[PDB]
């Protein structure tokens, strides 16, 4: 997260860290959507151009965290994966269309002050909240700036970062890039003419873009950190998987495989 700030304790209790078993490293963000299901970006698990193709046994999920690197002894919970479900029409060859995956935990997780699920939007919520100029909130342990390279240490935060960003009009998203955008995506971030800054960055993928409903006071996950070109560049905007658009797939996986 670029130009964000340190999260408060318990601010994003649905935030999940996807962690590689060996070597021991941050892989991506993710979100907790029940006691047994985590949502993330598909490219965190499957990206053949970078030689990435993780199986269940290669990864863990760490839930309830604040510190990036420390094991938060009596606070975080570590879960293993039963199964990964990648969207069958995830397009890693071209534009990361449908950049979405579900991960079923081997056992349910007990909730706490630090560990709690986000809501997923229904049609009405999505039509109401996913409008240009409304702001949502992105969280992650990714890079603090676009990184020029190749090493990284000072570029990584000590604790989870948060930034609030406005949803951008589709024609603006489209004209900002030559990568083909789809209805399975939306973009967010400030225009150069707005002054304020901020974006997700590498290592933030899979993390949630959430919005707080002014009708019921709940947080809803509207997007998944997916892609961008650089980070926090003027005239560029972060791209997010559009959760509601993919919600029938989400529901089909959980209904058929879930617990």
């Amino acid at each position: 997260i670029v130009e964000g700030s340190d999260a408060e304790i318990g601010m994003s209790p649905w935030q999940v860290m996807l962690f590689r078993k060996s070597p021991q490293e941050l892989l991506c963000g993710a979100s907790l959507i029940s006691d047994r299901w985590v949502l993330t970006a598909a490219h965190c698990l499957l990206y053949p151009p970078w030689d990435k193709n993780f199986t269940e046994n290669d990864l863990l999920v760490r839930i309830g965290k604040h510190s990036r690197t420390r094991y938060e002894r009596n606070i975080e919970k570590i879960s293993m994966l039963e199964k990964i479900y990648i969207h069958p029409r995830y397009n890693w060859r071209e534009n990361l269309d449908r950049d979405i995956a579900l991960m079923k935990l081997k056992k349910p997780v007990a909730f706490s002050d630090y560990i709690h699920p986000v809501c997923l939007p229904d049609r009405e919520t999505a039509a109401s909240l996913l409008q240009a100029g409304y702001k949502g909130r992105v969280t992650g342990w990714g890079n603090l700036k676009e990184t020029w390279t190749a090493n990284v240490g000072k570029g990584q935060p000590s604790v989870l970062q948060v930034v609030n960003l406005p949803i951008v009009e589709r024609p603006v998203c489209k004209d900002s890039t030559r990568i083909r955008i789809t209805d399975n995506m939306f973009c967010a971030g400030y225009k150069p003419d707005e002054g304020k800054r901020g974006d997700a960055c590498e290592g933030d993928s899979g993390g949630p873009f959430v919005m707080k409903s002014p009708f019921n006071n709940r947080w809803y996950q509207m997007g998944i950190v997916s892609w961008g070109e650089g980070c926090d560049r003027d005239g560029k905007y972060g791209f997010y998987t559009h959760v509601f658009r993919l919600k029938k797939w989400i529901q089909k996986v959980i209904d058929q495989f879930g617990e």
Partner: peptide, 29 residues
């Protein structure tokens, strides 16, 4: 419980986090 999206340390304690007001204000301005 059906308590998705309500944070134990914030909504459940009637406590606001430091920047959520920004989000709410964006639905106006």
């Amino acid at each position: 419980e059906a308590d998705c999206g309500l944070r134990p340390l914030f909504e459940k304690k009637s406590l606001e986090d430091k920047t959520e007001r920004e989000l709410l204000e964006s639905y106006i301005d």
